[PDB]
Amino acid sequence: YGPDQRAQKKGDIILGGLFPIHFGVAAKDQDLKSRPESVECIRYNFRGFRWLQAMIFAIEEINSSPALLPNLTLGYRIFDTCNTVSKALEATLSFVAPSTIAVVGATGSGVSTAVANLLGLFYIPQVSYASSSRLLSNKNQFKSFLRTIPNDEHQATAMADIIEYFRWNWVGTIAADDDYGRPGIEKFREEAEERDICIDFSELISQYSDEEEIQHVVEVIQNSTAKVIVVFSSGPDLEPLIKEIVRRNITGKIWLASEAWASSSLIAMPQYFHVVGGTIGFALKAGQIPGFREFLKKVHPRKSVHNGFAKEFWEETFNCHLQFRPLCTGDENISSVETPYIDYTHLRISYNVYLAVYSIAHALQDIYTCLPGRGLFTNGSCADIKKVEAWQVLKHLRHLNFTNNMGEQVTFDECGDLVGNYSIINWHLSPEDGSIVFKEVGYYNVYAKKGERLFINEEKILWSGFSREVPFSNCSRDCLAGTRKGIIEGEPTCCFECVECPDGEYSDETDASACNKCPDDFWSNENHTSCIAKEIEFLSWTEPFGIALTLFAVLGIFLTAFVLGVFIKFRNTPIVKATNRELSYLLLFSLLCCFSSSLFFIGEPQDWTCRLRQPAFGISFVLCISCILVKTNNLQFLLVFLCTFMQIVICVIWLYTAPPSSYRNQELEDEIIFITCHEGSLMALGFLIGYTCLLAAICFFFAFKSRKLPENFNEAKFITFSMLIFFIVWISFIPAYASTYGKFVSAVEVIAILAASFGLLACIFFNKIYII
Amino acid sequence: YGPDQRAQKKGDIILGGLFPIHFGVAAKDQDLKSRPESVECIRYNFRGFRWLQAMIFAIEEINSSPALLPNLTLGYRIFDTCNTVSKALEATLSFVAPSTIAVVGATGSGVSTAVANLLGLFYIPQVSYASSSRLLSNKNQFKSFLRTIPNDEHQATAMADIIEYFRWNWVGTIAADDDYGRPGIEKFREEAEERDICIDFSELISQYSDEEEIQHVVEVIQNSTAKVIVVFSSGPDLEPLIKEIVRRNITGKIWLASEAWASSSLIAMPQYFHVVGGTIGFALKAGQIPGFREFLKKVHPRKSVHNGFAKEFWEETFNCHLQERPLCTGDENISSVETPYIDYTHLRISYNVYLAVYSIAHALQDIYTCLPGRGLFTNGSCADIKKVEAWQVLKHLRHLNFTNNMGEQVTFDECGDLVGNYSIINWHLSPEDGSIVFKEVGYYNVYAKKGERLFINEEKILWSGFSREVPFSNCSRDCLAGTRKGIIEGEPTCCFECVECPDGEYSDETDASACNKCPDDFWSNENHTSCIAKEIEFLSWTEPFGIALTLFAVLGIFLTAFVLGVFIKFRNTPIVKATNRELSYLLLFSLLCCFSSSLFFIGEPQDWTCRLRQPAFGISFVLCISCILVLQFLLVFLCTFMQIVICVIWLYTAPPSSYRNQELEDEIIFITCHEGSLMALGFLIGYTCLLAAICFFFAFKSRKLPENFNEAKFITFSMLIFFIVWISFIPAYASTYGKFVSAVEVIAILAASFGLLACIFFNKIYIIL
Ligand SMILES: CN1CCC[C@@H](NCCc2nsc3ccccc23)c2ccccc21
Ligand SMILES: CN1CCC[C@@H](NCCc2nsc3ccccc23)c2ccccc21
Ligand SMILES: N[C@@H](Cc1c[nH]c2ccccc12)C(=O)O
Ligand SMILES: N[C@@H](Cc1c[nH]c2ccccc12)C(=O)O
Ligand SMILES: *[C@@H]1O[C@H](CO)[C@@H](O)[C@H](O)[C@H]1NC(C)=O
Ligand SMILES: *[C@@H]1O[C@H](CO)[C@@H](O)[C@H](O)[C@H]1NC(C)=O
Ligand SMILES: *[C@@H]1O[C@H](CO)[C@@H](O)[C@H](O)[C@H]1NC(C)=O
Ligand SMILES: *[C@@H]1O[C@H](CO)[C@@H](O)[C@H](O)[C@H]1NC(C)=O
Ligand SMILES: *[C@@H]1O[C@H](CO)[C@@H](O)[C@H](O)[C@H]1NC(C)=O
Ligand SMILES: [Ca+2]
Numbered sequence A: 001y002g003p004d005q006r007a008q009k010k011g012d013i014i015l016g017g018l019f020p021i022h023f024g025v026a027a028k029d030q031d032l033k034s035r036p037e038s039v040e041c042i043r044y045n046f047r048g049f050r051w052l053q054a055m056i057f058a059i060e061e062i063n064s065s066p067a068l069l070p071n072l073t074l075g076y077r078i079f080d081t082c083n084t085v086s087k088a089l090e091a092t093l094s095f096v097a098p099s100t101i102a103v104v105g106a107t108g109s110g111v112s113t114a115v116a117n118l119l120g121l122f123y124i125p126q127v128s129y130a131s132s133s134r135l136l137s138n139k140n141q142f143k144s145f146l147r148t149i150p151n152d153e154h155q156a157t158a159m160a161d162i163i164e165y166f167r168w169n170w171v172g173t174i175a176a177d178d179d180y181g182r183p184g185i186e187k188f189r190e191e192a193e194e195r196d197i198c199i200d201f202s203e204l205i206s207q208y209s210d211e212e213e214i215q216h217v218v219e220v221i222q223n224s225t226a227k228v229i230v231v232f233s234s235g236p237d238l239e240p241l242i243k244e245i246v247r248r249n250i251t252g253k254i255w256l257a258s259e260a261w262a263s264s265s266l267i268a269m270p271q272y273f274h275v276v277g278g279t280i281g282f283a284l285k286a287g288q289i290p291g292f293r294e295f296l297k298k299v300h301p302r303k304s305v306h307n308g309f310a311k312e313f314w315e316e317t318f319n320c321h322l323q324f325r326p327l328c329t330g331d332e333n334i335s336s337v338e339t340p341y342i343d344y345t346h347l348r349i350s351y352n353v354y355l356a357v358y359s360i361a362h363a364l365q366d367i368y369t370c371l372p373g374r375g376l377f378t379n380g381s382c383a384d385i386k387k388v389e390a391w392q393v394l395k396h397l398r399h400l401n402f403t404n405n406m407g408e409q410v411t412f413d414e415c416g417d418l419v420g421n422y423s424i425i426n427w428h429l430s431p432e433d434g435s436i437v438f439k440e441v442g443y444y445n446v447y448a449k450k451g452e453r454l455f456i457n458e459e460k461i462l463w464s465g466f467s468r469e470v471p472f473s474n475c476s477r478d479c480l481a482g483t484r485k486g487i488i489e490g491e492p493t494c495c496f497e498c499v500e501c502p503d504g505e506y507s508d509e510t511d512a513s514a515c516n517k518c519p520d521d522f523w524s525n526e527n528h529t530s531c532i533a534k535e536i537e538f539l540s541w542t543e544p545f546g547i548a549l550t551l552f553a554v555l556g557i558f559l560t561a562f563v564l565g566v567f568i569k570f571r572n573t574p575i576v577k578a579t580n581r582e583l584s585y586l587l588l589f590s591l592l593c594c595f596s597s598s599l600f601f602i603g604e605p606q607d608w609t610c611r612l613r614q615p616a617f618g619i620s621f622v623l624c625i626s627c628i629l630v631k632t633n634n635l636q637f638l639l640v641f642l643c644t645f646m647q648i649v650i651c652v653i654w655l656y657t658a659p660p661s662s663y664r665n666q667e668l669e670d671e672i673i674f675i676t677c678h679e680g681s682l683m684a685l686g687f688l689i690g691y692t693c694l695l696a697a698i699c700f701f702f703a704f705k706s707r708k709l710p711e712n713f714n715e716a717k718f719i720t721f722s723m724l725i726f727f728i729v730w731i732s733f734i735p736a737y738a739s740t741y742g743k744f745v746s747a748v749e750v751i752a753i754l755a756a757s758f759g760l761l762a763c764i765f766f767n768k769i770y771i772i
Numbered sequence B: 001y002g003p004d005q006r007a008q009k010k011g012d013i014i015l016g017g018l019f020p021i022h023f024g025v026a027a028k029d030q031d032l033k034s035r036p037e038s039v040e041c042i043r044y045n046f047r048g049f050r051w052l053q054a055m056i057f058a059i060e061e062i063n064s065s066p067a068l069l070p071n072l073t074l075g076y077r078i079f080d081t082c083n084t085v086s087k088a089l090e091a092t093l094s095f096v097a098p099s100t101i102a103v104v105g106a107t108g109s110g111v112s113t114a115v116a117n118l119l120g121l122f123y124i125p126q127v128s129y130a131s132s133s134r135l136l137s138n139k140n141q142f143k144s145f146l147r148t149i150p151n152d153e154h155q156a157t158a159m160a161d162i163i164e165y166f167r168w169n170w171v172g173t174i175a176a177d178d179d180y181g182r183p184g185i186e187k188f189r190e191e192a193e194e195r196d197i198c199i200d201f202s203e204l205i206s207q208y209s210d211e212e213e214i215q216h217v218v219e220v221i222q223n224s225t226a227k228v229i230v231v232f233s234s235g236p237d238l239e240p241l242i243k244e245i246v247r248r249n250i251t252g253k254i255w256l257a258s259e260a261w262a263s264s265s266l267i268a269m270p271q272y273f274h275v276v277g278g279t280i281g282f283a284l285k286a287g288q289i290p291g292f293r294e295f296l297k298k299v300h301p302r303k304s305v306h307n308g309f310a311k312e313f314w315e316e317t318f319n320c321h322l323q324e325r326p327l328c329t330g331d332e333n334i335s336s337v338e339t340p341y342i343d344y345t346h347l348r349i350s351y352n353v354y355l356a357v358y359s360i361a362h363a364l365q366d367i368y369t370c371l372p373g374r375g376l377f378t379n380g381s382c383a384d385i386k387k388v389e390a391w392q393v394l395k396h397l398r399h400l401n402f403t404n405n406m407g408e409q410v411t412f413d414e415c416g417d418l419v420g421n422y423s424i425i426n427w428h429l430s431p432e433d434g435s436i437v438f439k440e441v442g443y444y445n446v447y448a449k450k451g452e453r454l455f456i457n458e459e460k461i462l463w464s465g466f467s468r469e470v471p472f473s474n475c476s477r478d479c480l481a482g483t484r485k486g487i488i489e490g491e492p493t494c495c496f497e498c499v500e501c502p503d504g505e506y507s508d509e510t511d512a513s514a515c516n517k518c519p520d521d522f523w524s525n526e527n528h529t530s531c532i533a534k535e536i537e538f539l540s541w542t543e544p545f546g547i548a549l550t551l552f553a554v555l556g557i558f559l560t561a562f563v564l565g566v567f568i569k570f571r572n573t574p575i576v577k578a579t580n581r582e583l584s585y586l587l588l589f590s591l592l593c594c595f596s597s598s599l600f601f602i603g604e605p606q607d608w609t610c611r612l613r614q615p616a617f618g619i620s621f622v623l624c625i626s627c628i629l630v631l632q633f634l635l636v637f638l639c640t641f642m643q644i645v646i647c648v649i650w651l652y653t654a655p656p657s658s659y660r661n662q663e664l665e666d667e668i669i670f671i672t673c674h675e676g677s678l679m680a681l682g683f684l685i686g687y688t689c690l691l692a693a694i695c696f697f698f699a700f701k702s703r704k705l706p707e708n709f710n711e712a713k714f715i716t717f718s719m720l721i722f723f724i725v726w727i728s729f730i731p732a733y734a735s736t737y738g739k740f741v742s743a744v745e746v747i748a749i750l751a752a753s754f755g756l757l758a759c760i761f762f763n764k765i766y767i768i769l
């Protein structure tokens, strides 16, 4: 039963094996018009043949070594798969129909699942060397499946770890449509969604995809703008897409390869290097087998009776025919042909096959060496090596713990899986022969804490095979300090737009999603990067004008004092005696008060300065005018007292019913703030000005009626002149009072006060001073 | 050999069958201390037994029919699977080892794939009735698989269509870990991502899941705000999670069920209604098989000798034992016990099994009725019905075309697939008994273009089983008008925040991603939904201030006209002749011009007004001053002509123009005029002031002379008035910007003109009249 081509040997215990000597079957359309015939597989697999030789070498070495299973020999029964489920099921049917003790598993995950479904019925243990699908770790469906290779969850996590380490957020994914790529892509999608990474496209490929599908995938890749692509597939399934992309000449992409095709000879070609240069992928850990290469080099089509594949091996290696293609003898050298059969650098799957073979032998030895009364079966008994059975071997494999030739313990967990380290490689170009050379740049440690597993040597990486600069795989560029992030409808969060912050607000981050606002008494600078303090505007003594306006007030004070001194010294003189001396003294004191009252309008407006800035001039000028109207021909003193008392009443009631107070205003201009004080009540100020103007008008009329008189050196005309200039300077500033609101309101008030005081002093006293 | 429990009959052609008589197997895991034994099955499946009976009915009816396969008989060989791959693989090994022609497929997708992997080796056709996975459409790996049920791509598309129809963007997903749930969830994820729908979580379940996994899934469900959950699984896989959720009393969720568990009896139970009420799911199209209920109701443990499952059927129906718990006598009635065996409303998978049996039976008739020379094989030949083979039956099934018992046409496409309509159902509570009722609320057409496939009646839906209001699942409330969207870091694009638009911008529609700016003459209102026109400020005729100034101007003009009229009405008296008669006419004409020149400062400043605003007053006042300054006509003409030169040079070099100011306040437009060359205006001011100054000096040096009513005193008075009014204007010009600068100009002009006229002419006009 089974195919004609096989490798067979006899022994006390027989082992099974399945290896992919071919890459795939011949593609054709079978119309059911004639009886269907057997399908043939086409291309050859030197790597699979090397795996088969590794298994045979392990079995033969175990037989030769007398320290393991004495007085007992092992045989084998090995078939070919051509990487197809149908071919592997024919061989498996002959395994369960001599009986096999255990089978060394297949390569593909789907083939392994199909074989294990049949193998688990009879409880025949199956140890695989290359199937890493997470679906095979379910022990409810696969009762007797073990493997020497770890599952792909760690690799899928490592891919996301690498992507996060190189700071990318815009990637695409491609997977093969089988039991190996889909769960891996699902796990990677979960991890990437956890790590805040956006995925643009996701596609499925196959070895038997057609022209429309390949062109659609190529157009999707071409139209996409992401530059990093994660591929979870194998070489036979990835070849057509690579061929089409090479034909279309698409460059500038970054490939993240899984372990299946990170070292495949189908893709690593010099012709394709200009599209797949700089690939970063994963590799397992290499082992050491001493005499393996010597065992490999000794194959021969005539000296290998047990091996049936050696004939076609010779045919494919030497392009000949064994008794158009010529006739080749049996005298050639396999060390002069460039084939992957012996052109290897590390052994990984070969070491997996070695370990999978040795595990069964160790379990058999454990069965053989049992001491009665301390076994694992029923009431402490154990099996017998004369008629041992598959379920007993499976139990002992489930309870196995041994150390290998290198010195590491081998143990299978509850799910029958091992644990192992990963390595990271980079594709380069050989300067001598042009071949692709795999250069190690990092590793992945699975015994470390989360977030401490990845190590990357950045300086040893060429990115497209010729570049030393890390690529750019962001959807959009980063925002600046003065801008914030926007929203583009119909796009993921990884893509946005930068919008400048509005006036009065600032931002200081390169990825800010909003604009900040530092607190009051502050404003945002011109480009809204930082917020600066506001400026306070007010006329103070420091203000240049303030110092000029103070120079003037003290000049007036000094002039009044000098006039008073000249008057008091010459009191008895008839010129002074003509006027009332006490009235002159009171008038000069009131002029002193008027010149002093202008010094309250300058400076910081404290709550008391603005309380008395106005009445200090109002009362003084009222007293001046009242004394002036008196000095014209003591009752007059009491009339003066009445005139001052009337103003005192309204001033006191105003200050006691609605005091004026300081005020900081931030409304006229946003960037600057003012300090100006309102009057509280406006009726009081209006009435003050009205009473002052009423007394002024009364004095003006009274001095107008008696204008034409020469008494007192024509005082009654200079009085009218003084009243006229007072009225003119009061009228001239009404628009300034009613319109502006800055520091110019204070300065004009001081100017008017000084003008009125100076005119009132000069017009009255200059004539008498110039003659005394 | 095969399992002892089976159903068997003999005929010319033997058919195969696989049905799930049991829900599963016992979870007793051996420790390999002793030799392993056969595993047993736990629960009974009346629906599976009915499915099994349908095939036997179809075969019996075919054998009874005399016009379909005369002189031929059909046998069968049916086994149990217990929904397990291992049990179904044991039966399949007996099929390929007295040779079957075709096998009626299994129920589960994984079991179907496992059976097809072995059945394709020998090219034995296999027609399934319930496996709808899209992985079975691959003809490069399944060379002999056909099905009477459509695949799940249409259902996955319809789920996203329903979600878009009910306007949701915040959902969760739950799937079974097998070949039925994962591809469906993948296709649904693709469709939902294409349709702009955000998915919160995604979890996997299984029939043999453990306590910690179930609690983790429950916590993941409970910690989210998404209310709509899409489930692609079956009842046996869903039961533990539903039981745990019922135990923890989680309510308020909306379930979207796939066709596998949308009618499962394991989930649709009264005790779980408070959790799974108001479920919306899919269903296939029902069929009609006459004489089928009568065939179903005739089962008996003794009369049915070919069937071997009848004894266990009886024991599970009546809960007793059979002699070969009480003892079953064997005379009870099936209609007196309520089990899903005969308590049904529609036949869908039973009709699928019937269709598969008849599809197998028609290819044999096609082989039998061929004509030599025109055949489906080499050289136009055909086979022999006495030695027909599986590959020939497969060919004739691949080239099959026949009419149903209703009248529709049955053909298998290049992938051995069918297409069919979908039905949409809702879960309710029956007030009569309390059972769950599946109420039809819509359908899903497949013979239509994209976008016109789904019909839903919303008025027939109860939400959570008791409500008539469409639920809410957003992750964010809608942003209103005048408000903008905002990014939340670390969250999907479906969750955002609302931010108000700034000053000067607006937004009208809802869910706006940006605020639009307003045109150059509009400004946003307080609510920032739309902007309004800016206000334009300038002195106007309608404004009362302008009307007052206009009234003053016309009064002055009329007074000047009256003065001139009285002057001309007394042309012979010597009082007028004492002064220059002709020069006074020029003086009064210049006075009229000066009065009239004050109407160019009122109104909206146009281009032509601002060009001749200033020169009119300048020329008029120079005329007046030069006339007062004094042969005499020559002197005044040459003195006043020099200003026309600078006026025309100004108006030819840099004419002033109107200007709209939008830089002082952002909500107010100030329309003023700029002079341009300030040097020309300064020169006009200087020339006028210098002429006034020389006139004032000449009149001041000779005040005392009473030549004619002391005219020198009045001339000096007028000059002083002019100089005083054109000094009082300085603060208003300096710090009263706006519409108040134009007013003080008019006031000063009118005051100066009135002072001049009153000083010069009134006294003489009072003496004359
Ligand atoms: C009491 N006071 C002090 C000296 C300046 C002047 N006060 C002018 C204030 C003012 N007038 S109108 C207006 C509109 C808004 C704001 C302020 C004003 C004055 C003149 C004569 C007599 C007393 C006084
Ligand atoms: C040409 N013009 C006609 C319009 C009115 C006025 N325009 C000048 C306004 C002005 N701006 S600053 C200044 C400083 C002192 C005086 C005025 C001004 C004016 C006045 C006197 C003579 C001629 C004219
Ligand atoms: N892990 C792959 C098989 C595989 C591993 N390494 C390989 C190298 C070459 C070819 C195939 C492989 C699978 O499960 O399908
Ligand atoms: N379609 C499901 C099987 C199925 C369909 N309808 C059902 C009803 C009950 C149980 C199972 C089913 C699958 O492929 O796995
Ligand atoms: C396996 O055996 C070695 C050698 O005795 C021992 O050191 C180790 O602890 C064992 N491991 C386990 C997991 O039992
Ligand atoms: C894996 O790598 C880490 C770090 O290099 C190392 O410490 C550890 O021993 C490795 N594990 C094995 C099994 O070699
Ligand atoms: C790409 O995006 C990541 C994640 O947001 C960010 O840290 C990184 O700076 C971006 N790259 C560049 C070049 O801006
Ligand atoms: C099947 O038969 C019908 C009825 O004769 C015919 O119209 C149709 O073209 C045939 N083929 C298909 C694929 O339906
Ligand atoms: C599906 O329904 C539509 C109407 O919704 C009908 O025209 C069509 O015939 C139906 N298809 C089948 C196969 O019954
Ligand atoms: Ca030995």
Ligand SMILES: [Ca+2]
Binding pocket: A020, A081, A083, A084, A106, A107, A108, A111
């Ligand atoms: Ca394989």
Ligand SMILES: [Ca+2]
Binding pocket: A193, A194, A195, A196, B490
């Ligand atoms: Ca996150």
Ligand SMILES: [Ca+2]
Binding pocket: A047, A235, A263, A264, A265, A266
């Ligand atoms: Ca390879």
Ligand SMILES: [Ca+2]
Binding pocket: A490, A491, B193, B194, B196
């Ligand atoms: Ca989109």
Ligand SMILES: [Ca+2]
Binding pocket: B062, B063, B064, B065, B066, B067, B068, B069, B070, B071, B072, B073
């Ligand atoms: Ca018949």
Ligand SMILES: [Ca+2]
Binding pocket: B018, B019, B020, B081, B082, B083, B106, B107, B108, B111
């Ligand atoms: Ca089944």
Ligand SMILES: [Ca+2]
Binding pocket: B047, B235, B263, B264, B265, B266
């Ligand atoms: Ca059911």
